[PDB]
């Protein structure tokens, strides 16, 4: 993230920072976005193609 033109550390080398957003996988955290659900180690509901909540609500 330092100045690529100079390519060395220096007084003028530092600049803007970066916001990194790494995804991780959870088990039962309610705050996380659920992607799958299981009942006694068995899959609960499938979805063969793209999921769209608002669209599906209209279609229903």
């Amino acid at each position: 993230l330092l100045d690529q033109t100079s390519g060395v550390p220096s007084y003028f080398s530092k600049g803007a920072d970066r916001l990194e957003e790494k995804m991780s996988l959870t088990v039962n955290d309610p705050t996380s976005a659920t992607i799958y659900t299981f009942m006694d180690g068995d899959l609960y509901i499938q979805s063969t193609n793209a999921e769209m909540d608002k669209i599906n609500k209209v279609l229903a």
């Binding site: 550390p9 220096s10 007084y11 003028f12």
Partner: protein, 70 residues
């Protein structure tokens, strides 16, 4: 005077007897260090990071009659 060196920048810490750096004295230092600094290098002047230590002491004394303001 303490000189701290960095790549492409120079910063000069100075203080008077009191530990302060007046703006006028800062300008004088800058003007005098125009002739000294290298070409193509940046020079900056700053005050010394003064630290005023407050000291409350309790002094035990032997001669109680000599206790006074002086």
């Amino acid at each position: 005077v303490y000189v701290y060196e960095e790549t492409g920048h120079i910063t000069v810490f100075a203080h008077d007897r009191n530990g302060n750096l007046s703006d006028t004295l800062k300008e004088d230092i800058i003007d005098a260090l125009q002739d000294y600094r290298p070409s193509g290098i940046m020079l900056d002047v700053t005050g010394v990071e003064k630290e005023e230590v407050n000291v409350s002491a309790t002094v035990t004394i032997s001669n109680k009659s000599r206790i006074g303001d002086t």
